[PDB]
Scaffold this active site. Structure first.
Site, PDB file in Angstrom:
ATOM      1  N   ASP C  91       0.803  -1.215   0.000  1.00 25.25           N
ATOM      2  CA  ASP C  91       0.000   0.000   0.000  1.00 25.25           C
ATOM      3  C   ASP C  91       0.840   1.271   0.000  1.00 25.25           C
ATOM      4  O   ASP C  91       0.276   2.369   0.032  1.00 25.25           O
ATOM      5  CB  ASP C  91      -0.953   0.007   1.203  1.00 25.25           C
ATOM      6  CG  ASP C  91      -0.274  -0.417   2.495  1.00 25.25           C
ATOM      7  OD1 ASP C  91       0.971  -0.353   2.572  1.00 25.25           O
ATOM      8  OD2 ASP C  91      -0.990  -0.810   3.439  1.00 25.25           O
ATOM      9  N   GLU C  92       2.161   1.152  -0.037  1.00 26.91           N
ATOM     10  CA  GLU C  92       3.062   2.290   0.001  1.00 26.91           C
ATOM     11  C   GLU C  92       3.798   2.447  -1.325  1.00 26.91           C
ATOM     12  O   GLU C  92       3.899   1.495  -2.106  1.00 26.91           O
ATOM     13  CB  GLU C  92       4.071   2.139   1.148  1.00 26.91           C
ATOM     14  CG  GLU C  92       3.420   1.871   2.496  1.00 26.91           C
ATOM     15  CD  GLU C  92       4.324   2.210   3.664  1.00 26.91           C
ATOM     16  OE1 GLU C  92       5.499   1.792   3.651  1.00 26.91           O
ATOM     17  OE2 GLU C  92       3.856   2.892   4.598  1.00 26.91           O
TER      18      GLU C  92
END
Ligand SMILES: [Zn+2]
Ligand SMILES: [Zn+2]
Lengths: 49, 215, 110, 49, 48, 146, 83, 49
Positions: C91-92
């Protein structure tokens, strides 16, 4: 991470010098900096520093 | 540097996401567009210009869902707050509980940072129709209900518990007990005598339901 | 500090006395050595082992990007060897590692 | 008919001391289970007990 | 029949969700598998 | 000074990168910091497990502790190929995770799971259990087997 | 009192092995205490085999009280159980 | 030397699990009438059959 640890007496002071090489950090890709090592040294309980 | 700043920002963002999921799972009203907040929007809104994380702008109130207030007779609003101090004192905990009592909230969640002294632990039960729950930030980095080894827990209302007791023809003390301060029980916020239904999934038998009672 | 006495062959204890100067005092016999002027030191050489490489040859036959190098006191190179590597969670943003063509000094961005 | 009969007679009979049977069925393989060296999926030094 | 946790019926559009599992579910599972096996045999005929 | 920790977790002795049969890579560490391992970035926090059961309990609840007990006992039994039915293992796991906490099977665990005076007296610590039962005036219902 | 009526019975109609063992034991003890038998023995002089013969065509007059674990028993005649 | 430890473990297990039984409502209960499992194994099937 340290080449050496040594103890140096000044004329009226006494300290411990540690030589950290950035080469080992870069070669291992550790996300570590010099001030990180400093604050990690501060987090030691038995040394009471 | 990046190590002292961006990692802290990411940890705080994931803690915020886990708290949002926790509040949604209790039955409170949180939309899916708030829980899926990406990192960029969090850094834009909840973070300072120079990268510092501010937490007094992070605390928020949560209200019950219509479905939850239909199923559950009484359920109030929480005020989840993040303390800026790394080591909370008795003074700031007293300030927090005074805030919770003054604003007339049914429950409150106090997300501390590093450690809380027992002199501040002893003061969270002080308010009769309200309760205070404390959560460590490292205990909020990863959601524990999304783990594979933890099956789905579902709290049951008093009528639901009474129906289960009538069906199995047994008293409250005969169910397999679950301690409060358990991580899953802390996630659900279970009171004494509240019954949670667990949906286990074994490979041999498939899905089957067990039951547990707090304390 | 492992200094040994030249009179009684004992351990030298460094003491300040009361004037504030450290001396290599010996409590077994009258002898000390002031440390005025030149300083003394004892270095313990920590071992140096060959640890495992992580980016050994990670920039061979790779594309070269146009990024300003942080070190401008040594080289003026503007072409940098870069490599995209997923290091954080999904998610980064995907981090990358890139280095100067002249002076090395690898650095990363997220 | 055969499948339904097998399933319906395969249900646990009430009154069975199932805890006793389970305790024995866990305990008695310990007699036959001799010590043998084990490693976890292709690495030798993990020496799992 | 699958009652909910409340002692009421469950509408026949969301039976399979994981919040109304009863003690009889494994039994139901067995029957499905049984039917599925017979289905296979029927398939093994039809393609032939 | 050269024995101080500067980067990592205090309880993790060592870490080994291993390859699974499908080619994907996993990380095996030897320590007790489950929460710290599964909270670090880059490691999936939903599928990380450990063979130790008390860590699983204290991190992920009594139900995850029960699952860890069942999986560990089944793995140990199937390693020797003794072919024990998993229902007995599930029963044992439900027994140790009965009273809300992993109490175990010992003289310190039976004294918490079971309130029968005579059974606990007959198992271990006869004198202490009998004298404590006499002092606390605890009635014993004859319902057990012992 | 607490007896479940003869239609709301919610226990399996099959006769388990323990019920069989207890029924045969009680019937053999009764026969060994000189009770009449409802089957034509053919010279068998052991109460247990006579009890087995009685069970084989369901002539034992005993019934079984299946105590549910809340204080509510449940009557089942031996002639009604399937086995 | 395996026999002593194996027998001790078997005795401990059997002393722990001696009171369980499957009641007539298909629920495994202790001697003190408390439920351990609501159904044995989640489906109520004896491994014998
Ligand atoms: Zn000397
Ligand atoms: Zn350069």
């Amino acid at each position: 991470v340290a080449f050496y640890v040594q103890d140096v007496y000044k004329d009226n002071l006494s300290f411990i010098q540690v030589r950290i090489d950035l080469g080992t950090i870069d070669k291992l890709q550790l996300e570590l900096t010099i001030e990180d090592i400093a604050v990690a040294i501060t987090r030691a309980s038995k040394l009471k520093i | 540097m990046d190590q002292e700043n961006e990692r802290n920002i990411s940890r705080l963002w994931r803690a915020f996401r886990t708290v949002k999921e926790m509040v949604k799972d209790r039955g409170y009203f949180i939309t899916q567009e708030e829980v899926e907040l990406p990192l960029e929007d969090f850094k834009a809104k909840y973070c300072d210009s120079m990268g510092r994380p501010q937490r007094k702008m992070m605390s928020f109130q949560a209200n019950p869902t219509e479905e939850s207030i239909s199923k559950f007779p009484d359920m109030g609003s929480l005020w989840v707050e993040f303390c800026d101090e790394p080591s909370v004192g008795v003074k700031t905990m007293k300030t927090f509980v005074i805030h919770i009592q003054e604003k007339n909230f049914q429950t409150g969640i106090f997300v501390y940072q590093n450690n809380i002294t027992p002199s501040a632990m002893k003061l969270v039960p002080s308010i009769p129709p309200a309760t205070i729950e404390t959560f460590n930030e490292a205990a909020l980095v990863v959601n524990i209900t999304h783990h594979e080894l933890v099956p789905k827990h579902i709290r049951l209302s008093s009528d639901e518990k009474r129906e289960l007791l009538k069906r199995y023809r047994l008293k409250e003390s005969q169910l397999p007990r679950i301690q409060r301060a358990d991580p899953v029980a802390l996630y659900l916020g279970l009171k004494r005598g509240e019954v949670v239904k667990i949906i286990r999934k074994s490979e041999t038998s498939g899905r089957y339901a067990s039951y547990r009672i707090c304390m | 500090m492992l200094s040994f006495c030249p009179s009684c062959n004992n351990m030298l204890l460094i003491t300040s006395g009361d004037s504030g100067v450290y001396t290599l005092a010996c409590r077994s016999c009258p002898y000390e050595f002031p440390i005025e002027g030149i300083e003394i030191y004892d270095r313990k050489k920590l071992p140096r082992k060959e640890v495992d490489d992580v980016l050994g040859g990670g920039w061979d036959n790779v594309d070269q990007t146009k990024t300003q190098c942080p070190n401008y006191d040594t080289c003026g190179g503007e072409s940098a060897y870069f490599f995209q590597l997923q290091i954080r969670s999904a998610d980064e943003p995907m981090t990358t590692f890139y280095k100067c063509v002249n002076c090395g000094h690898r650095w990363k961005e997220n | 008919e055969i499948a339904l009969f097998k399933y319906r007679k395969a249900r646990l009979e009430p009154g069975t001391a199932i805890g006793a049977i389970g305790a024995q069925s866990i305990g008695e393989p310990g007699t036959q289970m001799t010590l043998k060296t084990f490693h976890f999926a292709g690495v030798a030094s993990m020496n799992v007990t | 029949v699958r009652y909910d946790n409340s002692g009421c019926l469950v509408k026949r559009e969301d039976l399979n969700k994981a919040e109304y599992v009863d003690q009889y579910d494994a039994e139901r599972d067995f029957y499905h598998s049984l039917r599925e096996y017979i289905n296979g045999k029927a398939t093994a005929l039809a393609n032939l | 000074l050269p024995d101080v920790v500067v980067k990592g977790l205090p309880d993790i002795s060592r870490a080994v990168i291993n390859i699974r049969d499908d080619g994907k890579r996993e990380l095996l560490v030897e320590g007790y910091g489950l929460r710290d391992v599964m909270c670090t970035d880059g490691v999936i926090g939903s599928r990380t497990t450990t063979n130790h059961v008390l860590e699983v309990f204290s991190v992920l609840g009594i139900e995850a502790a029960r699952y860890s007990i069942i999986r560990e006992i089944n793995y140990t039994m199937s390693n020797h190929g003794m072919s024990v039915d998993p229902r007995h293992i599930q029963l044992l796991g439900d027994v140790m995770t009965y009273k809300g906490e992993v109490l175990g099977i010992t003289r310190f665990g039976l004294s918490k799971m079971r309130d029968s005076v005579l059974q606990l007296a007959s198992f271990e610590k006869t004198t202490d259990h009998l004298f404590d039962a006499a002092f606390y005036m605890k009635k014993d219902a004859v319902e057990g087997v012992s | 009192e607490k007896a479940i009526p003869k239609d709301q019975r919610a226990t399996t109609p099959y006769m388990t092995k323990y019920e069989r063992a207890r029924i045969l034991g009680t019937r053999a003890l009764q026969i060994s205490m000189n009770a009449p038998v409802f089957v034509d023995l053919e010279g068998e002089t052991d109460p247990l085999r006579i009890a087995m013969k009685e069970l084989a065509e369901k002539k034992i007059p005993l019934v079984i009280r299946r105590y549910l674990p809340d204080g509510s028993f449940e009557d089942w005649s031996v002639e009604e159980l399937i086995v | 030397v395996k026999t002593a430890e194996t027998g001790y473990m078997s005795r401990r297990l059997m002393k722990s699990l001696e009171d369980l039984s499957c009641q007539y409502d298909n629920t495994v209960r202790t001697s003190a009438n408390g439920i351990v499992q609501f159904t044995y194994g989640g489906d109520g099937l004896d491994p014998l059959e």
